Every structure is written in C-alpha cells, then in structure tokens.
C-alpha cells in the first residue's frame, strides 16, 4: 500500500463526503456531478494534510477541507455564471458545504478560534484580489503573476493554514503554508494552460499571453522552476513531508513537458 | 429614547458594512446597495435588546449585521438581477461574512457556539430555498411552511447568536422565538410589497391573495398568531419589553397599509350586521345596507334600505351594536 493508494482513497473520501452532502441539502443530480467532477480540488486537501501522522485525523481534516474548498469552487461558478448549473441550488449549496466546513475544522482544531483567525486574517488580500484580477487582465508576466497570487496562492495558503491548525502537532505551519501557496501557482499556471482551449479562455489567460508574445516561454520555464524550488525547500523543513516530494515534480513537469508546447 | 438608540444603532450597523465593503473593493454602487437595506441593519438591534451590557451590545449589532448583509448579498447573487458586478457582489459577500465569524466568535460564550448554530439547521435553511424556488406555493398552508425556512429560520440563527454573543441574562429560547415570529410578520409585509416594486407572481402572498387561492381573514389570522408569538417571547424573563411598540407597529402596518392594497372593499373576512327585533320579528342588515344612524341615550337608532326605494327602520341598545355601526355614528 503505497502513497498513491493514500492519495487515491483520500481523494475517493473526500470525493463521497462531498456529494453526500451536496445531495442531502437538495442538490440537483446534475450539482452532485458538477463537484464530483472537481479532481484536483478534491486531491489538494491530501496533499495539505501530508504532515499529519494520525491516519484518522488526517482524513477528517482532508474532507473538512474538500467542503470548504468545493465550496469556494460554487461561489467562483456563481460569479461567472457560465455553467448552466441553477444559481438557486448553486448558492444554497454553496453556503451548506461551507457551514458544515467551518463545523468540522473548528471541531478538529487546537483551539476552535485560530479557523475563523486564518479566514479572516488575509480576507481582504484574497476578496479584493479576486475583484482587481476580474478588473485589470494581465498584460504581462509580473502582471500574472501578481494576480495568480492571489486567487492562487492566497487561496490555498489558507487551506494549507488550516491544515496546520487542526492537524495536531508536528506541524511547521509556516511550511505546510510555504508549500500550499507555490504548489498553488504551478496548478494555477496548469489551468491557464489547459482552460485556453476547453472553455477558450483570452483575456488574461497566461496561455493567451504566450501565444500573443506578451509572455516569452523562457520566463515560465523559469517561474515553474522557481515554484518547484520553493516548493521542495517548504517540504523539507522540519518534521518534513517527504512524501510531497514526488507529487511537486509530477505537477510541474506536466506542465513543462505537456502543456507548454501547446502554447509555443 | 430607545427610538433615538434605534435610529443610532442602524447608522452604526450602516457605517460598519459600509466601511467594510469598500475596503475591500466594493463600488459605490453596491456600498449605496448595502447602506439602503434599512431593515437589515436595524435588525441586529432588536435582537440584542436582551444585552445589558452597551459596548457588548453594539460589537454583537454590528458583526450580526454584517452577516445578515452578507447573505442577502448572496441572495441577490443568485438572482442575478440588481445589475450589480457578480464578481464584487460574491467576494464582498464572502469578505463581510468572514468578518462577522471573526467578530462573533470573539464574543461568544463558547469557542464553537457559532458555527454549532450555524450548522445546527443549515440544511433545514439551505434545502428550504432551493424548494422554496423549485416549487412555488399555491395556498397559505404552502406559502407559511417556505416562509419559515428563508425567513423564520433565517432570522431565528441571528437570534440564537445574539444570545450566544450577548453575554448573562439572554434567554435564549426567548430570543429566537422573537426572531422567528418577527422574521415571518416582515417576510408577509416584503411579499405585499414586492408585488409591485418588483412585479413578482409566483408564490408571492399578493398574487395568491388576488389570485383567490388565499383568504384576507386567513393572512389576519396568522399576523395575529405572529403578533401573539413575538408579544409572548419578548414577555419572558428578564424581558425585552421595548420590543412590544416595534411588535405592533410592524404587524399593524401589514394590518392597515399592506392588506387592503390585496382585498380593496373590505376584504375583512364577514360583512358585519345589526341584529334587533321590529315589529315583533327577527331582522339582521349588513352594515352596507344601513342609511342613517343616530344616538338617543344609550339607544342606536336607525335607517336603512330593504330593497328598492323601500326604507327600513329600528333601534339597539348600543351594548349590541357592532363596531362598524358605531363607527357610522361618529362618521354621521
């Protein structure tokens, strides 16, 4: 039993705990397929709960965290309003994952208070970004960059805080949330580059930048690199999670080794 | 005074939200939205009524105002229809939501009575509004059963917050008893009035109440069992009664503003009558009948149509005239 069948019944757990409930509060069949549908965001949780050692703590902070997450995924589809889903189910929904989220996380934390410090704390970092990067579409790399950090980073920042906060001890918090946050802008720049040509993504889009020559295929060499390096350094700080070292290369040479060339 | 703490209140709940939207990117149009929902922001005042101490009492208005905001910004995002930005109306929802987590939690008793309330019957308020807007109600019975999910339980967590944030002395049951009945007495009044500031149909109390599938005297009835409701939690020890003044004006204002816009001449449930005895038979007239009336002592006596250019006449003791005749008197 090795680490990608922790990785797969994670993602299976959480995955079932999600349309569990997505169904019980009335979620239509078409809105529990919509989140089943969400493999990443539903994996993501695992890799954020690398540092904790009790197997049973560790899968309930991982599908705590699916929720919330899930949750966030629903609001950002109620924003763009582009997926046919009924915005009745997607908003109730939405707030329902999320409660029952901040339940579960306040019940596993050290002290029930630190979830409601870490959500509030950069809360306005990651909402007011959200608006600007909706605002200003980049015109750049640094401008990418600068947004992805946001909605990115900051976003999964705080899942990896969390994780720390309601994983017990042994946990490098600022680790776990190093790590989170440059994990999150390899997958960030992995979407951009697959969502250009499954939703035909422009503005904005890093893939459309490359493509118009805003951006030279060098410079996201490099920032990938970069990401990966800061990536493998968070892992490695003590106790260490040496299991994500494999996960960090896997995501970012998918995105050197088959998705750039499809922009360059 | 409490009409100048009242007022003071709401401004305060006003500046909170406000200052809190725009600093996190909200325009001037959706900081105007917010500062206009009046009622939402006064809320949190009646629910912390039961708070004797005023500093803790303004920190709870206000975080509870900011989560009340929050979620009918929500509401209005899945409508889709106030012509605000989506993206800034979801993540100034989200913003202001997780504000009031961080300032209700810093107030409550317990370290997890916040989201123990939250959770407790999230699905009862989450599943209710996603049927509330699958099926639209067709009869008061129908109409009252979704009413209590968006509205009464709605309302009802507020007020199992303020008590849970309000420090010694709340009686929790109490409060959110208030709320709900309260939630539900307002929840009548937007339906009778969003019929026409929005041209809304289906399931909305108004139409059904045009439409005849809802009977005048039915809606009386139920404001008067929410009326009763409210009067009750706010009697219970040690008491809320400030509250009763606001109880009366909002359900009166349904009473006699409201109402009759749906029911037009006298939609009062019976025409009243007058019963009397004249030349040695039985005789009841509607009060629509009825030409001229006067009073001799403590006699009512009077005039009225029997059917053509025929008059009737006849005399009650006053201890048996209806109100509605009596009110002819004054008026005559």
Redesign the interface.
């Known amino acids: 039993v090795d680490d990608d069948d922790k990785m797969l019944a994670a993602e299976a757990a959480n995955r079932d705990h999600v349309t569990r409930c997505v169904a ?4 239509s069949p078409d809105l529990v397929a919509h989140t089943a549908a969400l493999r990443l965001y539903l994996r993501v949780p695992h890799f954020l709960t690398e540092w904790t050692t009790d197997p049973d703590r560790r899968a309930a902070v991982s599908r705590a965290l699916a929720l919330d997450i899930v949750s ?1 995924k629903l ?2 589809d ?4 582009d997926t046919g889903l009924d ?10 994952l999320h ?2 989220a ?2 579960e996380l ?2 596993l934390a050290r ?3 630190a979830v ?2 870490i ?2 704390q950069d ?2 970092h990651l ?2 970004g ?3 990067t ?1 605002r200003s579409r980049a015109t750049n790399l640094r401008e990418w960059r600068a947004h992805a950090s946001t909605y990115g980073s900051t976003f999964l920042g705080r899942y990896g805080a969390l994780a720390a906060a309601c994983g017990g001890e042994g946990q490098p918090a600022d680790s776990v949330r190093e790590f989170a946050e440059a994990f999150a802008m390899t997958i960030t720049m992995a979407d951009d580059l697959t969502d250009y040509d499954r939703n035909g993504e422009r503005d904005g889009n890093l893939a459309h930048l490359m493509r118009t020559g805003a951006v030279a295929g060098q410079d996201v060499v490099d920032l990938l690199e970069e990401l990966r390096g800061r990536a493998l350094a968070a892992v490695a700080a003590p106790p260490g999670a040496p299991g994500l070292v494999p996960v960090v290369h896997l995501y970012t040479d998918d995105v050197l080794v088959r998705l750039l060339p499809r922009h360059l």
């Not at 019980?24 to 979620?27: K, W």
């Open positions: 019980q509060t009335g979620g966030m609001l950002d109620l924003m763009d309003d915005r009745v189910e997607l908003a109730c929904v939405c707030l329902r409660l029952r901040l339940h306040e019940s002290d029930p208070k409601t410090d959500l509030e809360a306005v909402c007011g959200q608006i600007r909706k």
